[PDB]
Design a protein around this ligand. Structure first.
Ligand code: 105
Length: 263
């Protein structure tokens, strides 16, 4: 609805930065509304969902096991590893790392999983392989969050990310068991409370993954809908603002409030 674009542009004005947006019909893949849909923005942690998608793709093909245990050490720990830093002794399984990476956005977990699939180069090849010729992961945590202006490294576009998530969650790319595991990790997301979830009406479904980076970077990707089932995909990114984390969170929440109001 056009009223939501009013809020998105209001958001660019208040944040003094670019805001990218897109609302996608989950079933048909039709773009319902957009703002800078094909402009690049850092992915920050929203990439962790694509990372686990590639991991599940491997499991389905027998190249990986969810119960497989990964051992790591202090040397591996990078900034913001609330779950992995507590398991140095016995390690964690592939399954537990994706849980950590998606629900808590644990950075070391991401790094460990990336290592299992062959690094950024491979995640990028996986994406290209599934029709996404835009999204690219080039670095590891934490450098991929640098958000250098005009830098194409570690970026995606609102349209590219929305189309790719739709495929991950409804395509024949993953088995049904794998698709549900991914959605289950996104539905349990525990660090995105002040964003879209704060505007979600009672009874609605939402599976999401947020992101934060340098230079005011903030974003979120999500599948949501009424009566406990998702029916649309929403992707929101911004970068360049000098606004506080709280102000950035609110603008996203308000964009959310509008898209829900005009559903
Ligand atoms: B991802 O969520 O974009 C990566 N986030 C971080 O690496 C991070 C850091 C370095 O310090 N806090 C976070 C973080 C934020 Cl700002 C929000 C939610 C989870 C982690």
């Amino acid at each position: 609805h056009p009223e939501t674009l009013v809020k998105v542009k209001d958001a660019e004005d208040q944040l003094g930065a670019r805001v990218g947006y897109i609302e996608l019909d989950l079933n048909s893949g039709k773009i319902l509304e957009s703002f800078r849909p094909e402009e690049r923005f850092p992915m920050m942690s929203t990439f962790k969902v694509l990372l686990c998608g590639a991991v599940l793709s491997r499991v389905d093909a027998g190249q990986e096991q969810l119960g497989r245990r990964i051992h790591y050490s202090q040397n591996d720990l990078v900034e913001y590893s609330p779950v992995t830093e507590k398991h140095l002794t016995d390690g964690m399984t592939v399954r537990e790392l994706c849980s950590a990476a998606i629900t808590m956005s644990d950075n070391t977990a991401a790094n460990l999983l990336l290592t299992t699939i062959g690094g950024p180069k491979e995640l990028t090849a996986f994406l290209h392989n599934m029709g996404d010729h835009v999204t690219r992961l080039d670095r590891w945590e934490p450098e991929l969050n640098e958000a250098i202006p005009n830098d194409e490294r570690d970026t995606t576009t609102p349209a590219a990310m929305a189309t790719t998530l739709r495929k991950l969650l409804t395509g024949e790319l993953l088995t049904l068991a794998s698709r549900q595991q991914l959605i289950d990790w996104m539905e349990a997301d525990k660090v995105a409370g002040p964003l879209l979830r704060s505007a979600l009406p009672a009874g609605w479904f939402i599976a999401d993954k947020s992101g934060a980076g340098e230079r005011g970077s903030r974003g979120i990707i999500a599948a949501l809908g009424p009566d406990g089932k998702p029916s649309r995909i929403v992707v929101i990114y911004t970068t360049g603002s000098q606004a506080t984390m709280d102000e950035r969170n609110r603008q996203i929440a308000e964009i959310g409030a509008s898209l829900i109001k005009h559903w």
